Amino acid sequence: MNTVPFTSAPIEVTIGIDQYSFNVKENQPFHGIKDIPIGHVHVIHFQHADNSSMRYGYWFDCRMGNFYIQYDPKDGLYKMMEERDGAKFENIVHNFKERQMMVSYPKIDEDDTWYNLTEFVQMDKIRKIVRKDENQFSYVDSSMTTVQENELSDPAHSLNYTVINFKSREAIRPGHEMEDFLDKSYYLNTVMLQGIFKNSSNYFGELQFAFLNAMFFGNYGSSLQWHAMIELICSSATVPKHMLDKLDEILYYQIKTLPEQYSDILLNERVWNICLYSSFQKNSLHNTEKIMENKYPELL
Amino acid sequence: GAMNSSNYAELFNNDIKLFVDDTNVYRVTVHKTFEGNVATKAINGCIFTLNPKTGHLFLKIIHTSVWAGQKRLSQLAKWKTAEEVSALVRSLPKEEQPKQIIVTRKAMLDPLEVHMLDFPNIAIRPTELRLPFSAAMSIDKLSDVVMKATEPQMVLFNIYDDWLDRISSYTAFSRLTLLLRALKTNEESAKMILLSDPTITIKSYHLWPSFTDEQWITIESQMRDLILTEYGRKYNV
């Protein structure tokens, strides 16, 4: 087990950790989250009781170090920090454990939701999308914009997702104009899989990370990335059979986990009605199709 | 953005631009097989590409051979239109390339944009106008060179004959749209008007009769009446 301890909780805040959310009152005695399952990336995030503007949070992996939360009264947020003194972090995690001022991450024996939502997400890739290498953990918020968004001001605060553009030279081979635009297999398989991502796990990792940033922070640019990487698979006639089956599982859990009340902004009518009913892979997403129709038949 | 009533006069400024119409690119005659089923038989078509300021027409003839062995021909027509338009731009000197291309149907936007990726400073635009360029095959000389063609062929015309010697582009475009709209509404009557006077000939290097200015007014009024009338006969008004 691993622990994200807290200095204190000086301002009323809603804390979410992966798919969960909970409330802490101003100066209630709160000193973090313990029993965090090792082996996955995690996200810890914050929505202040007073300014629901700006959800912000930190992606991290406990294997990569000892991380703690301190509220900064100058900058006005809960900041993730690293304790390099292993020996002294180990010690205070005990008094936190012994005074029972840490909540227990529910290690439920009937779930795999977080595993499944983060199967291919790896801290090393996250940190190439969110560039800030002095820290081992990665900060994200509501308002950060993507590299592609900045094209159409500050790039250090960028989400450096892989640029997908269906009406670009990268995507369209000269002389196969009609072919490559109606069947994107070349772009997915040769440009992106073999060229940029190298394998489908790195692709699937970005897709999953993009969906998670859209849901927990309502990052609009991430949602556009998620929908684009979905649309490119579904608009390719030729996809490794292994990818298709794994994609069905990925999307299944993303839709499962989505807040029912959030489906109006974060889901793109066009992309899904096309992926589920018009595209090459309309018959290859059985679980995803079934759960979309029982839950959100309105959108379709 | 889209081209409508409101920004109509942009067409006649000094920015080079072209209209592309694709309605006569893929043409069929539907018929019955011996088994009582229906098949199509394609006939030659045209891409109608027009400089509205100069009247230059680049008539690209689409030979029926281009369709042999191809599926989903109505979708293929739009990609072939775009491929041929980009080849025309590519073949022109840079200072002759258009700064805009206006497609008369929205289904052409994506095909052309994709074929024109090499030209990002060329704006591809739809229009909200119901332009009558489908009627271009009611112009005898254009229909004839399309039907006779044996191979792919580009033929160049000035669809305004010598009119610009005497009138402005705006007025010439208006006359042309009036003529084509009439031909579209009742070809027989439109044609009968143009030729009622056997003495007003069509010059070998022209498409339309050599009317005087006074005869153009008479003609233009007669085309207006036809277009109103055929509205009554259709709507009963």
Ligand SMILES: CCN(CCO)C(=O)c1ccc(Cl)cc1Cl
């Ligand atoms: C002074 C060093 N320090 C905070 C940095 O000023 C601590 O020792 C500390 C206190 C509380 C917790 Cl949850 C973690 C830690 Cl590391």
Ligand SMILES: CCN(CCO)C(=O)c1ccc(Cl)cc1Cl
């Ligand atoms: C699902 C349990 N629960 C109810 C959520 O509204 C929580 O508040 C909760 C979640 C996560 C953690 Cl680390 C601690 C706690 Cl108390």
